[PDB]
Design a protein around this ligand. Sequence first.
Ligand SMILES: CC(C)[C@H](NC(=O)N(C)Cc1ccccn1)C(=O)N[C@@H](Cc1ccccc1)[C@@H](O)[C@H](O)[C@H](Cc1ccccc1)NC(=O)[C@@H](NC(=O)N(C)Cc1ccccn1)C(C)C
Lengths: 99, 99
Amino acid sequence: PQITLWQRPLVTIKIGGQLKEALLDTGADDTVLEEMSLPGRWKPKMIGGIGGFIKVRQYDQILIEICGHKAIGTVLVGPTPVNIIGRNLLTQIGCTLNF
Amino acid sequence: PQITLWQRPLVTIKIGGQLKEALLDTGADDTVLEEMSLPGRWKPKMIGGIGGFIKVRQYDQILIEICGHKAIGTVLVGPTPVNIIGRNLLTQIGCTLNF
Ligand SMILES: CC(C)[C@H](NC(=O)N(C)Cc1ccccn1)C(=O)N[C@@H](Cc1ccccc1)[C@@H](O)[C@H](O)[C@H](Cc1ccccc1)NC(=O)[C@@H](NC(=O)N(C)Cc1ccccn1)C(C)C
């Protein structure tokens, strides 16, 4: 699609057989989802933003589908206000910024 | 221009005839710049992110220019580690997400 930015670029993702909404976020390096159980082993990790650092769990090599496009990569799960799709997965689906 | 997401989408902005660099960020609602003293009237504000909130000063009607494109709007100033161009100014420059 072409997405304009008059509103938040929220899309539907499919992950772990769940449907969620998530924000397509060019300013995030990483992908951060709200707390959930995923299959897999995980490593504790820290990530930061405005306001500080949070503790998250890192899951590697996770399959996610964003608007019908598949991505396989690292997902962090932790106490985020909103599900964030970062540049690690946006690049896999061929996302660009245009103007 | 088409900006790819392999690297962080940092561009040059001009604000007050200063060049700076800034992150084009579709996940930010607002624009947030590193501490600087602008003329103008301000309001105190709090903005949140990953690890919590910071305190900023809000200036309205600021002209910024982003890759030769002018935009005019609200800018928040405070102790951010990076300059962030948010959706309030990205929309004005006609910026889209495409995949
Ligand atoms: C999500 C994490 C992994 C991300 N961090 C990083 O990517 N890094 C720390 C790497 C880095 C280092 C240096 C330079 C650039 N990047 C982040 O917080 N990114 C911020 C920008 C930023 C980068 C570095 C340091 C500080 C800040 C931003 O790109 C991202 O869009 C976040 C996402 C988010 C939204 C809501 C709540 C929590 C996170 N937005 C924000 O932090 C903005 N807030 C909002 O827009 N809102 C709270 C409104 C809102 C609410 C709900 C949904 C959307 N918007 C700030 C900049 C104003």
